[PDB]
Design a protein around this nucleic acid. Structure first.
Ligand SMILES: [K+]
Ligand SMILES: [K+]
Ligand SMILES: [K+]
Ligand SMILES: [K+]
Ligand SMILES: [K+]
Ligand SMILES: [K+]
Ligand SMILES: [K+]
Ligand SMILES: [K+]
Ligand SMILES: [Mg+2]
Ligand SMILES: [Mg+2]
Length: 1169
RNA sequence: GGAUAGGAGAAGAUGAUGUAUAGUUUUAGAGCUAGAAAUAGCAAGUUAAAAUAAGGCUAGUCCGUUAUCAACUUGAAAAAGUG
DNA sequence: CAATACCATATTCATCATCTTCCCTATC
DNA sequence: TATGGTATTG
């Protein structure tokens, strides 16, 4: 009994088939377990496993980090409150308690309902004096009077809780006082560098034009329009664009050779500026220098829309400006609406459902929706004027808590907080003593290279502590080892040397690694001349000279330079033929030239004794990104260089890691020669062996040491490189193969032909390697692997062309059988191919081409050369194909109605429910967001996810008498309930109200559990209260091919014959419909939908056959396995008819399917109760 | 064929960490005038606190949405055995 | 109870690391 | 997306 296995691997399906030598699919009897009358069942050995897609880890990680951020924000507020504690207690012993319970209803409140002061009069007074928190912030920044401690806390808390971003490094110190003067000074520098061509900047209001609350490009265009003879692409135009934050290119301004794009935000502005000035001249520096000065005064103009001189709180003042303009424009708009149209005042200022002002404030209308709503009403009326300008500038009726506040840096909030602390520390001593602590609460971040501040219970953490104590914002630098933590941050993700697995790879920019690459390329270079008979290899001295004269004087080395600067200047050759390198050498010594420019000491870089130093330096520049840590680490070598050299080293960083370790490049040495790999690359006599040759040479001891230096299925698949969905498909494929092998009496197949859905692809090679290493586990006498099973991989186009050439067409919309059919055809074609041309094994088996598939055909074209009926192997003489019976066998297999389509049952995981926080409602569907927040008072969640249902057989109390009535029903265990239910199912069910639960009759039913009812009708579990369609529609292959040909009506005469087949078999349409109808009336039970379908088909029966076939393909949605879905027949829409009740499957037959569906356990549920 | 090291640009796949802004929910921000009331007229609106998976024990400024899952027997589990 | 329509958190920056493919050089 | 939860309307 010999057999082969065909596999079609997809992201949502694994199709499988078993074929024999005659390319037939066997049919067996399988035992049926359970309690029904059926003891066995006939099964064809072909099918497909269907499953929901595997998900990436992204959403989980995002929610994880959001959780962390909420926790740490709460801890910031707790730090600030603990600082204020005792003095607040002396002022108001329940202030923080009122803040904590602000969310509670007055019934549940333990203190007075007014948070700040505890009485209504003072609260109304506060809100009247300070209508927004920014009024209080500005007052506390600017006033010299002692303030109530509660307002001080509220201001500091608003700043710390919403502290702004950390994208800008250093300090800011805002100052918009002299934008005009800095612009005039930039014009002065320009006119001094170009005395013949000045710029007349008189009458140019640069202040209003560069802080015009418009795009950087718009303000640039406007400032250039005020300058005749000057264009935006000119030198001054590009300088202005640089001051505005754009990225101008100063190449054409200075007639440069290459680009010189400058941006003040990049970390490389100093380097780019110094390079441009080295190209053009340092006397232009005061130009860009001036451009930076002005830039500072503009660096924050979009956020601080107020003068910095009248207040030390520019941001709160800009918010107050927003508020005042909102108030004034609202009064104006109210008056204008009242006057113009008395109607629509209700719609605009009272209807929360509309995107008017009511929906903008009270409803769910965003600023953009409200703008779209009011723009036509504003244009219709008159007197609007500046309102439309504010609207198109997006500065009309603005709130203070908006989406664009993401622009606000944390330095601005820090400035206002520092000002408030400076003001109020004169009256409160604890504020003076804890000023820096509070500023630190605002400023402190956890470094990205530190990670969670865990203590041995986080699989995500790598941080190391210098001392065992709680980490606070104030002791972080003393308790946390920032250096070791950053090193762990990088190293825990970098690869070890695959040759020496206990060795880390070098930095990609290591000087040693670059020497290795340069010498590995140079050692295989050959040069020929006239007097030479054959190409000779470069000797050690020649390679050293080329490295010293070309690679250590030019970053890149060209073949022209190799021939003219060495072979002519040194060897006195006028013509030389080079081989091994095209145009230019790929390897180079970039790190060498970088360090040579930085330190300006060639003898330092050429001295081999300075090797281990430089390496570490490069390592430090690769290991670390934080410039402070780089400075601290490089301080050890500050005795070798100057202060300027050390600063240039600080500003130099690298990223990237090589693939080989230092102990492999320069470390291990051959036993008899004492030379390392780099030593052989520098000089190997006349052999000039490169890296692979050296580590593959049996006459050397490198291969021996590499050999001396040298998991579970789920682990191994999880560690592969690929999308998680395809990894799911791979694991399911392996499990299907294990089951199929077990079905064949533990006998292994001859061939496994795999095809991966969309072969040199690496993931298909991984599948093939896993299968090959699992099937072939024995060795022969020569200690070589015995390949009992040939693992062939085929690309989808082979079987696709096979189908389209022999008319075995697929229609994916008809059912899911096409996956199993693909697996079968893969098995057939792969086995036939390797039986016909065995020499192709090295190409297809793990471990002329345009006509490779022609042996299947009988007539082949312009050849028109015939072929025999019986195709055999040339040498073995074995029959591989009988065109008189094997095509009929394939056609018979593709027509079998019984195919094992199995939907993988899966417990649902993930979020508990929909995330929307719903308002309070009188419904038991609402879920409390906190233990004590009764959703009838506070709202909450609805729509939870059912992890799996449970069949319960028990009694429930009925009526006021609480009479016990026997029940049997499906209970949905939600994801949030799951741990509680599994910890104690009886107590969970009793708390749900169930009494006398038959614990042994409890059946766990995950999603997609299968039930059979009458007439073979099947249903799958979608939830505890909804079902999906469970039957496949096995349509005859004649209708399949007819639909294929009628749909894609649009080139041999066979196209004309296919059109003739379509026109002769138009009646098939009706038959198809009839088939569907029967299927429906047997398994779908969608009366109204089936009637709408019949009527729509009768209406468009006069349509072209092509469109009718396409719309019947659409109609197949009604019968498809799985969840119901709406579809469209011509212009008629058929909505999904759902199965909103799971009551019938309580008396049906539950079917537990194995992975292939061949092994079944059938439980008659009507017997329970 | 497969594999390895390197190079130019691109085009994708994946994993982790540290941040920010909103949104939503309840409460607070005295609504007024006629009306018994139903209701009508007007005034007003921009802000804040708190929660942001219920929660957990390991109690950390940590963890809580990925992967993995037919039934039966054995298993903590992974997984193995049953036709 | 069934037919039916509505609903579903979003956007944003910074630092890394790993893998793949395409085309070249040199190899096992 | 799409498909399972929910309220609405009979
Ligand atoms: K109370
Ligand atoms: K101009
Ligand atoms: K709104
Ligand atoms: K808000
Ligand atoms: K090259
Ligand atoms: K770095
Ligand atoms: K899952
Ligand atoms: K199953
Ligand atoms: Mg929490
Ligand atoms: Mg908010």
């Amino acid at each position: 009994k010999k057999y082969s296995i065909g596999l079609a691997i997809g992201t949502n399906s694994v199709g499988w088939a078993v074929i024999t030598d005659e390319y037939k699919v066997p049919s067996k009897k399988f035992k049926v377990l359970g309690n029904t009358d059926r003891h066995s069942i006939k099964k064809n050995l072909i099918g497909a496993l269907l499953f929901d897609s595997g998900e990436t880890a992204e959403a989980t990680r995002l929610k994880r980090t959001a959780r962390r951020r909420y926790t740490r924000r709460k801890n910031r507020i707790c730090y600030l409150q603990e600082i204020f504690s005792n003095e607040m207690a002396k002022v108001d012993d329940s202030f923080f308690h009122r803040l904590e319970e602000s969310f509670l209803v007055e019934e549940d409140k333990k203190h007075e309902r007014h948070p700040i002061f505890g009485n209504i009069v003072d609260e109304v007074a506060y809100h009247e004096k300070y209508p927004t928190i920014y009024h209080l912030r500005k007052k506390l920044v600017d006033s010299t009077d002692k303030a109530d401690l509660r307002l001080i806390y509220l201001a500091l808390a608003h700043m710390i809780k919403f502290r702004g971003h950390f994208l800008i490094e250093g300090d800011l110190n805002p100052d918009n006082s002299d934008v005009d003067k800095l612009f005039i000074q930039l014009v002065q520098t320009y006119n001094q560098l170009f005395e013949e061509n000045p710029i007349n900047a008189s009458g140019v209001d640069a202040k209003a034009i560069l802080s015009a609350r418009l795009s950087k490009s718009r303000r640039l265009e406007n400032l250039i329009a005020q300058l005749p003879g000057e264009k935006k692409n000119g030198l001054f135009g590009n300088l202005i664009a640089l001051s505005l934050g754009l990225t101008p290119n100063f190449k054409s301004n200075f007639d440069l050779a290459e680009d010189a794009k400058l941006q003040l935000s990049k970390d490389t502005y100093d380097d780019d500026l110094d390079n441009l000035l080295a190209q053009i001249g340092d006397q232009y520096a005061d130009l860009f220098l001036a451009a930076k000065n002005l830039s500072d005064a503009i660096l924050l103009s979009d956020i601080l829309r107020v003068n910095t001189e009248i207040t030390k709180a520019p941001l709160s003042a800009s918010m107050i400006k927003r508020y005042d303009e909102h108030h004034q424009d609202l009064t104006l708009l109210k008056a204008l609406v009242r006057q113009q149209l008395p109607e629509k005042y209700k719609e605009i200022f009272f209807d929360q459902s509309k995107n008017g002002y009511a929906g903008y404030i009270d409803g769910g209308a965003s600023q953009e929706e409200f703008y779209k709503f009011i723009k036509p009403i504003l244009e219709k009326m008159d007197g609007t004027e500046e309102l439309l300008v504010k609207l198109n500038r997006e500065d009309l009726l603005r709130k203070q808590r908006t989406f664009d506040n993401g622009s606000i840096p944390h330095q601005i909030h820090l400035g206002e907080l520092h000002a408030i602390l400076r003001r109020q520390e004169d009256f409160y001593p604890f504020l003076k003593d804890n000023r820096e602590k509070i500023e630190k609460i605002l400023t402190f971040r956890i470094p990205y290279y530190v990670g969670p501040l865990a203590r041995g219970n986080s699989r995500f953490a790598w941080m190391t502590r210098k001392s065992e104590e709680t980490i606070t914002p104030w002791n972080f630098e003393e308790v946390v080892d920032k250096g070791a933590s950053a090193q762990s941050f990088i190293e825990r993700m970098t690869n070890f040397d695959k040759n020496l697995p206990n060795e880390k790879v070098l930095p990609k920019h290591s000087l040693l690694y670059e020497y290795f690459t340069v010498y590995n390329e140079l050692t295989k270079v050959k040069y020929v001349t006239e007097g030479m008979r054959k190409p000779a290899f470069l000797s050690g001295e020649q390679k050293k000279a080329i490295v010293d004269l070309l690679f250590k004087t030019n970053r890149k080395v060209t073949v022209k330079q190799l021939k003219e600067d060495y072979f002519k200047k040194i060897e006195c050759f006028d013509s030389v033929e080079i081989s091994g390198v095209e145009d230019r050498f790929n390897a180079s010594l970039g790190t060498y030239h970088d360090l040579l420019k930085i330190i300006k000491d060639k003898d330092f870089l050429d001295n081999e004794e300075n090797e281990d130093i430089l390496e570490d330096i490069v390592l430090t520049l690769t290991l670390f990104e934080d410039r402070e840590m780089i400075e601290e680490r490089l301080k050890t070598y500050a005795h070798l260089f100057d202060d300027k050299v050390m600063k240039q080293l600080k500003r130099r960083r690298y990223t990237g890691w090589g693939r080989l370790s230092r102990k492999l490049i320069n470390g291990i040495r051959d036993k008899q020669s004492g030379k390392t790999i780099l030593d052989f690359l520098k000089s190997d006599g006349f052999a000039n062996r490169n890296f692979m040759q050296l580590i593959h040479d049996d006459s050397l001891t490198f291969k021996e040491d590499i050999q001396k230096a040298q998991d579970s299925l789920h682990e191994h698949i999880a560690n592969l490189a690929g999308s998680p969905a395809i990894k799911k498909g791979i694991l399911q494929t392996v499990k299907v193969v294990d089951e199929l092998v077990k079905v064949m009496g533990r006998h292994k197949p001859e061939n496994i032909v795999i095809e991966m859905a969309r072969e040199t692809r690496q993931i298909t090679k991984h599948v093939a390697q896993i299968l090959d290493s699992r099937m072939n586990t024995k060795y022969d006498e020569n200690d070589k692997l015995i390949r009992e099973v040939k693992v062939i991989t085929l690309k989808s186009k082979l079987v696709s062309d096979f189908r389209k050439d022999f008319q075995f067409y697929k229609v994916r919309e008809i059912n899911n059988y096409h996956h199993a059919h693909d697996a079968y055809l893969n098995a057939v074609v792969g086995t036939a191919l390797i039986k016909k041309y065995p020499k192709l094994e090295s190409e297809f088996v793990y471990g002329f081409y345009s006509n490779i598939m022609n042996f299947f055909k009988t007539e082949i074209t312009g050849e028109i050369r015939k072929r025999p009926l019986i195709e055999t192997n040339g040498e073995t003489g074995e029959i591989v194909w009988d065109k008189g019976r094997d095509f009929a066998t394939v056609r018979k297999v593709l027509s079998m109605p019984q195919v094992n389509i199995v939907k993988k049952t899966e417990v649902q995981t993930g979020g508990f429910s929909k995330e929307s926080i719903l308002p309070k409602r009188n419904s038991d569907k609402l879920i409390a967001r906190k233990k004590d927040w009764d959703p009838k008072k506070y709202g909450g969640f609805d729509s939870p996810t059912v992890a799996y249902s449970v069949l319960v057989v028990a009694k429930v109390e009925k009526g006021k008498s609480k009479k016990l009535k026997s029940v049997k029903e499906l209970l949905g265990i939600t994801i949030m309930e799951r741990s509680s239910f599994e910890k104690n199912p009886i107590d969970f069910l009793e708390a749900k109200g169930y009494k006398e639960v038959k614990k042994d009759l409890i059946i766990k039913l995950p999603k997609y559990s299968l039930f059979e009812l009458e007439n073979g009708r099947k249903r799958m579990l979608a939830s505890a209260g909804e079902l999906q369609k469970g039957n496949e529609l096995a349509l005859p292959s004649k209708y399949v091919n007819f639909l294929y040909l009628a749909s894609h009506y649009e080139s041999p005469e066979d196209n004309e014959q296919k059109q003739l087949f379509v026109e002769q078999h138009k009646h098939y349409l009706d038959e198809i419909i009839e088939q569907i109808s029967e299927f429906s009336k047997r398994v779908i039970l969608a009366d109204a939908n089936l009637d709408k379908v019949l009527s729509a088909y009768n209406k468009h029966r006069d349509k072209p056959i092509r469109e009718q076939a396409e719309n019947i393909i659409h109609l197949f949605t009604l019968t498809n396995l799985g969840a119901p879905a709406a579809f469209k027949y011509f212009d008629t829409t058929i909505d999904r008819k759902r199965y909103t009740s799971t009551k019938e499957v309580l008396d049906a037959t539950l079917i537990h399917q194995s992975i292939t569906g061949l092994y079944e356990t059938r439980i008659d549920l009507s017997q329970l109760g």
